Point group: C5
Amino acid sequence: ACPRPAPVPKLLIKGGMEVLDLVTGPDSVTEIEAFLNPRMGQPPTPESLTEGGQYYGWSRGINLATSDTEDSPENNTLPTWSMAKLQLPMLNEDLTCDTLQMWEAVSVKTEVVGSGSLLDVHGFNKPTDTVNTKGISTPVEGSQYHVFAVGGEPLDLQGLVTDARTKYKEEGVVTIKTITKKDMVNKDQVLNPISKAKLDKDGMYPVEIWHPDPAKNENTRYFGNYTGGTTTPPVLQFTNTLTTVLLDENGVGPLCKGEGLYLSCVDIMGWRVTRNYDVHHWRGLPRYFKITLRKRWVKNPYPMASLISSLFNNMLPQVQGQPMEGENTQVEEVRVYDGTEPVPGDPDMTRYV
Amino acid sequence: ACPRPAPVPKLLIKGGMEVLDLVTGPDSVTEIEAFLNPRMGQPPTPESLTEGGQYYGWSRGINLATSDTEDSPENNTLPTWSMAKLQLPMLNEDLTCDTLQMWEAVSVKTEVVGSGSLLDVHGFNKPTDTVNTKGISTPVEGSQYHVFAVGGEPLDLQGLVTDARTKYKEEGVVTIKTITKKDMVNKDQVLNPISKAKLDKDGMYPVEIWHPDPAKNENTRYFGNYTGGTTTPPVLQFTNTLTTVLLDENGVGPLCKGEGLYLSCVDIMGWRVTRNYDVHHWRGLPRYFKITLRKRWVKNPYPMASLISSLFNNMLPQVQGQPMEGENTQVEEVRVYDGTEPVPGDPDMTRYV
Amino acid sequence: ACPRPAPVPKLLIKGGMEVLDLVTGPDSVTEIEAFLNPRMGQPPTPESLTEGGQYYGWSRGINLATSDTEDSPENNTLPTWSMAKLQLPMLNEDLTCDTLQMWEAVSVKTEVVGSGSLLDVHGFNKPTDTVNTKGISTPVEGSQYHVFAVGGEPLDLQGLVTDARTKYKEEGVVTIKTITKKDMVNKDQVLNPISKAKLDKDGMYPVEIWHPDPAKNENTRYFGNYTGGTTTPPVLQFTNTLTTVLLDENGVGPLCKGEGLYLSCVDIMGWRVTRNYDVHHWRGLPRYFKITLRKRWVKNPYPMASLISSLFNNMLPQVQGQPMEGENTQVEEVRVYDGTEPVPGDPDMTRYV
Amino acid sequence: ACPRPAPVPKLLIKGGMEVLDLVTGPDSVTEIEAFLNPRMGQPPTPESLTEGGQYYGWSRGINLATSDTEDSPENNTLPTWSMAKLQLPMLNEDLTCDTLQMWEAVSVKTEVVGSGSLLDVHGFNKPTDTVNTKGISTPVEGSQYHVFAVGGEPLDLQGLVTDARTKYKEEGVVTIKTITKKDMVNKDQVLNPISKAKLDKDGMYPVEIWHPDPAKNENTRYFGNYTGGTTTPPVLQFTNTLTTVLLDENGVGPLCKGEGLYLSCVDIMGWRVTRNYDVHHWRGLPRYFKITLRKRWVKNPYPMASLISSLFNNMLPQVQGQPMEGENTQVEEVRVYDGTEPVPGDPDMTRYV
Amino acid sequence: ACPRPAPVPKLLIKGGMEVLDLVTGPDSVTEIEAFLNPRMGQPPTPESLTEGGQYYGWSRGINLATSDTEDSPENNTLPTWSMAKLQLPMLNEDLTCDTLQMWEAVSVKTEVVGSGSLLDVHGFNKPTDTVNTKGISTPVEGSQYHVFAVGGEPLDLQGLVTDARTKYKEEGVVTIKTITKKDMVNKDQVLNPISKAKLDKDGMYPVEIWHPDPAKNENTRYFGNYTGGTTTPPVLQFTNTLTTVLLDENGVGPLCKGEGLYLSCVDIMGWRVTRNYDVHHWRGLPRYFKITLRKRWVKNPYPMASLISSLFNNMLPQVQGQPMEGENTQVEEVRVYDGTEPVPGDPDMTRYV
C-alpha cells in the first residue's frame, strides 16, 4: 500500500565511452556529452605561458596587406573550424531479410561556455581613455560568428572569399588551391560549384574560406549566425533547459553512417586590441554538446554480395581506356526499355520552347 | 518476422535537370536546388584578376554628384536584380473535358551563402586606426538589402527613386525612361502607377529604381527587408532546417505558367571603403534556393479552339481605325442585358453622394 | 471521369471602382487596392524639376529657432498626415423590419513601397568623409514614424506638442489654435481633452501636433511605431504574403459608415543632410493598402421617421433661449421612473466616501 | 423572415462616472477610460507660458553634484510616479450567509499618447552640428522608463538608490527618510526590507527611489521596462487592438478593495539638451488606460459583528503595558492544541541540521 | 441559496520560515519569497558612508595591468557569485517499503529590483560634455551579465579565463589555483575538464573565472545572458505576472537534496566612470526569487542498512595499500557474468575501426 513514485526512464549505466560497450537493447537511449575547444590561430602545443603569453584560445595577431595584391594571412592568424568524431559501437544486422540497425541523433543541447570570462576588464589591452591611457582595458568586441553542426557524416563545405588574390600559405591550412589544384579564380568570390570540400581535418579549414554547404548537407543539421561590425558588443545566452530537435520532415534525424557522429563548431566572439599597436587577436569560446541518440531499423542499401565484385575489381587490371564518363565522354546515348507501350508518333517530344 | 523500417518518400532518380524528363506520375514531388550569384556592378566577363583586382561580386566604385543637377551613376556602380528561370517539362492535358495539369511551387528553402567570408580583416581597405594607418582593415558595413522571390511568372516591378533629375545611362541598364519613353517626372519620386515593369532581363534592373510591385504580383511570393545606415553591422543567419511555405489562403501557391519557374533575388551586404580615397564598392553574396513543387490539376482557361480566331487574326488586315479603346475612346456606353427584371423606376440609381 | 480541380473563390469581375456598380449578392467579397503618397512639406503642384530640384516626396528644409520664443515652422517643412476616402456603393435596406446592410473591412495587406530607393548613395548630400568631401553621400537616416489606419470614419486625432510657444502659420495648416480658437496653453504640452480633431483634410494636419486618439477611435484600427534618434538607420520589411486582421473581440471590424472607407497613413523614413549647410529635408515613402471587405447585416440605428422631426426642425424657429445644456446649465435635476419599487428609506444612497 | 444580425453585448448607457449610478445587474461589464498625465518635475500650477516657457510635461533642469558628498536634487528635477483612483459605487451584500459582491478588473488596454510629438525638430535645443550651431535641434533621447500598474489597492513600493549620501529636500517629496524617520544607510543601496511604502500620494514619490515591490503587490498587476544610455533613441508602439489580461493563475484579477481602482504609471521618454549649457530637462508622455471590469461574488472576510469589538476598543482605555509584540517581546512561547494525538516521544523533533 | 464564490487554493498560514514547521499534508504547496543582494567587490561590513562613500552594491575600482605579465586584480574589484540556501524541514519516510518524500521546486518568479535607480543623473561621475565638464553625469553603461539558478544542490562551476597569467590573490577569493593546487595552464583559457568547482561559498567565486557547468548541473535550472561592449545601454524588464517553469522533460524539477534549496545569481548592470581618472566601478542590482515547491514521493536511493558498513568503515583501519583506482591502477580487468549464453566464437568483438 505504499505510494508509487512517478515513472521515469531508467538509467542502466553511466561513465565514459566504454559504457557504450554494453549490449542494451532496441529501446535504449544514449546521451553523450562532449565539448569542442576553439581552434583559431595559436595551436595548443607550446604549453608554457612564456612563449608569447599563451594565446591558446586566441589568434596570434593580424597584419594588414601592404598593397592591393600582397596578402599573406599567416595561418596562425586565421580562425578555423573545430570538428570531432565520436565513434559509436556496432549494432545488429539482419541480413537474412534486408535491413540493418544504426544510430540516430534525435536531439541536441548545445551551449557556449565561458561568456562571463569577457568581464575581465583589467589587463594590458587598449584602454578606454587613450588620451591619458586610463580607465578600462577595452573588452572583447567586434565581428562574431557562431556555427555548430551535428551530423552522421563530415560537414560539406563550400568555398567563398573576399578578393581571390589572397595568397594563403600552402602548408598547415586547407584552401581552395589545395583542393582544386589550380589557382583561385574570380568565380571563387561569389560561388563556384567546384570549390567544395569536407570537414575531415580539424583546425585546418579557415572559416573565412569554407562555409557550410547548403546544397550538400543531408545527414547534417547545422545552425549558424554572423554579426559583423567593428565594435559590435557580444551577446550570449546560456540555459540548462532548452533543447534543439534534429529531426526532419520525415521524422528521421541524422543517421550515423559508418558508426561515427560528427560534431563541428566555430564560436568567434570578437577581437582584442593590444596597446603598443592596434593588434587584433581573435577570441573564441568552447562549445558544449549533449547529443541524445537512439537505435533505428533502416534498410541495408548495399548488396553485400557485391564484395565478389570487389574481388572481380581486384583481380581485373586497372584500365586506362578511352573517356566514357565526364567531360569528353564518348557515349552518344543510353536508352532504357522497360515495358510495352503502343507505337508512338514522334518518339521524342518534351518541353517545347 | 524482421522489423520494418519507417516509411519515407521514395527517391526515384536524382541528378541534373535531365532527370525531369522521366514521366513519373500524379503524386510525384520534385525538389530543385539552384543558386543565384549577385550581379551588382562589375560583370563577370573579364575573368582575369588583373584588370582591376576582379571586383566580380562587388561594385566598381561610387562617385558622388558634382552639383545638384549632375548625376551620372555609371551602370557598373548600381547593384541590380538577379533573376533566373528554370524551365520545367510539359505535363498532361485532358482537353476532352476542360482541365489541365501544371506545376506548383509548394515550398522553398533559401539561404545566403558566404557570411563568414566577411571575416577577412586583412587586405587593403581603410584601417580602423587611420591616424597611424594601423589596426584592422575595416570589414563590410552599411546599408543592407535582402530580397528574394519565387514565382510562376517574372516579378512585376514598380519605379521609385530619389531625385528624378538623375541621368542614368541609356544603354546596358533599364530605367524609367527606357519603359516610359518620356523623361522622369516628380511623381516618380513617390509613386507613379505608370512606371511599371517586369524582371525579364537579369542584371539590368537596378534595385534603387525597381522595387517589387505590391499591387501586381499574384503568382509570386516575395520576401524582403532593408536596413539603412552608414556603419550598420551586417547580420545573417543560416540554417539547414527551417523552410518557407509558398501557399496562399486558398492553399495553392505559385502555379508555374508556361512551364518556367522564376527565381529573383538581391543580397546587398554593405560597402567596402578603400584606402587612397573613400571609394565605396558594394558587396553581395549569392543566394541558394531549394524549391519543392508538385503537380496540380487546374482548369484550362483559354478556349484553345480560339486558334481559329488567331487564323482569323492573321488573314484579316491590320486596321488603324478610330480610337475605340483607351484615352480618347469613342464608345459612349455599353450595357449588358441578361434576364427579365420587372419594369424599374429611375433605371440608374446607385451610390448617393 | 476527368479530375476535378480544387475549389477557390470565383472572381466575377475586376477592374477599377466602376466594377463596384455590379449588384453581386450577399456573400460577395471585395478586394480594393489603393495607395497613398507621402505629403510631407513640398506640395505636388509645381511639377517642373527646376523650381527647386523637385522636393516632391521630401520636405523643403528645416530652420531652427532663432531664440527661445521665436518658432515659425513654415508649413512646407512639417510632415503631415495622408488620408484618402474610397466611396463604396449603396447596399440593401430592409426597412419593413428594422435592419440594414453595410460594408465591413475584414482585413488589410499594407506595405511601404520604395525601400531600396534609399540605396542611392551618389548625389549631392553631405559626404561620409567631410574633412576631404569624399566617400559616400550619406543616405537617409534619423527619426522614423510609421502609422497607418483603416476605418469606417475619419481618424480622430488628439493634440500634443513640444513647447506650446511655437507659432505655426495660420493658413494652409491645421493646428490647435485653428480648432480651439484661443491660443495654446501649457496643458497642450501633455494632454488636453479639448484639443481633439478629425482627419477630414489631407496634408494639413502635421504629425508633430496631431496623434491618433486612443479614447475616440472605435470604427478605426490604427497601427503605428516611432523610432527617434539622429542617425538611427532605417529598417523596413516588405512581403507579399502576411496580412493584418481588422476584426475586434466581437468579430465585426470597421463598418463603413456613410458608405466611405477611410485610409490614413504617415511614413517618415528619416532625413537628408545637404552640403552647403546641414539642411535636413525629410523623406517619406508611399504606402500600399489592399482592403478585403464583405457585406454585413446590421441594425438600422436611426428611426428614419425622424425626418418629420427634421421637418419640425425646419419650420420651427432657431431659438436663443437660456442655457439649458453645457457649462452654465439651468437644469437642476432629471429623474426617470420606470417601474414600481417598494417604498425606500433614504432615497439616495450610493458610493460612501 | 428578415435576416438576424449577429449578437453583440448590449450597451445600456454611456457617459461619465455618473453612469455608474445605475443598478445594472449581476452580468454587467463596465469599461472605464481614463488617462494619467506625466508628473516629472514642474508642477502644473503656474499656467502662464511666460514663467519659464512652461515646462509642464518636462523637468526643470539638472544640476550635477559639486563634490562627492554634496547632492541636493531640487524636487522639481526628479520625475515622480503618477497615480489616480477611480471610486466605483457600492455593490450588493448578502450577509444572511457570508458572501459579498465586489468589482474585478478583468483586462486593460493601455497606450502612451503623443509619440509623434517628438518629431518637433525645430526649436531652441542643442543643434546637431554644434561647431557651426546649425542643422537639427536634437530630439528627445536618453534613458527611458515605462511602468504602469492596475490594482485594487495602492502600489507597494520599495526603496533603492544610488549613493545613499544624497540629500533630498525634506518637503514636497517622499524619500526613505520621510518613512523611516532615521537617515539612509548603506543597505538602502541594495535592498532594505524596511524601506517600504505605498503610492498614496501623487507626484511625490520619485521614480529613482521608489520601485514597485515584488514581494508585496498581490492585488496589483504592474508591467515595466527600463532602457538606459545617454543617446538611446526612444521607441514606442501604439495600437487600437491589442489588450492585456489582468487575471492570475486562479482566474481572479485585481479585486477592487474598498471600492476604488488604482492606476499608476510613469513614462519617461528621454531628455532634452538646451543650448546655453547642456541642461537636460526630462520628458514624459501621458498614458491612456481603459479598464474592463465585472462583478464577482466573493467571501466576506471580516466578521462584521466585530464592530462590537470596535465598541469594546473605544470604551476600554489606551494601554501602555510591557512589550508583548515585536522586538523586545515578553511572550516566551505559544502552543495550540487541537485534537488527540498518541503520546509522543521527543515532543519537538523537526529539521535536523 | 446564496451564490458560491469561485474555488481558489486555500492559504493555511503565512509568515516567515517558522511557518514551515506546520505538518500540512501531501497536497500542500509552498511559496517562498527571498532576495539576493549583489556581492561585487566592496563587502557590506564597513557600514559607515564615510570610509569611501559606501561602494556597497558597487565595485571598488579597476586598475589595468602595468605590463603584459603583471595582473593583480585586487579581490574587492572582481564581481562574484551570490548564493543562498533555504533550509526546508524534514518530510515523511516510508522505510517499510522503499520510498521517501522530498520537496520539489515546481516554478519560480524572479525579478531584478532597482532598474529605475539608474535614472540618477546628478552626482560626481564623468559628465556628458567633458570639454566643459557640464551636462549630465553619465549613467551606468557597459558589459552586463545576468545569471540566476534554482537548484536542489549547489551550482557546479567550470573555470575559464582570459590570459592564464593573471595573478589573483591567494586569500579571500576562490580561483583555479585554490582548487587545482597547481598553477593555471593554457588549457584553462579554453576548457579544462579538471577546473571544476561548486558554489558553496558566497561572494568568493568571481564571475570572470567560474561559469555554470553545462555537463554537471542536473538538479539545477540556470538561465543566463551576457551583453558585452563599452557603452552598451542597459536594458531591463520587470513584471508581476510572468513565471518560469522548472520542470524537465520527465516533469520532475529540482528535487531538494538534503533538505535545502539553493539560489544563485549575478546581476551586473554596467560600470560607472568617475571624474578624476576614468575609474570604472561595477554596478549590480539585487534579485528577487519566489519559488513554488510541492512534495513528491521518490524512491529512497541508499540502503540505509549500509550504516553498518559505516560501522565497518569506522572500526577497520585506514589503509594505504597499492593503487587500485585512478591513474596508476593495478586492476587489469573486471568481467561480470550474469546468465547462460551459448558458447561464443571470438569472445570479444565490438566496434570495428
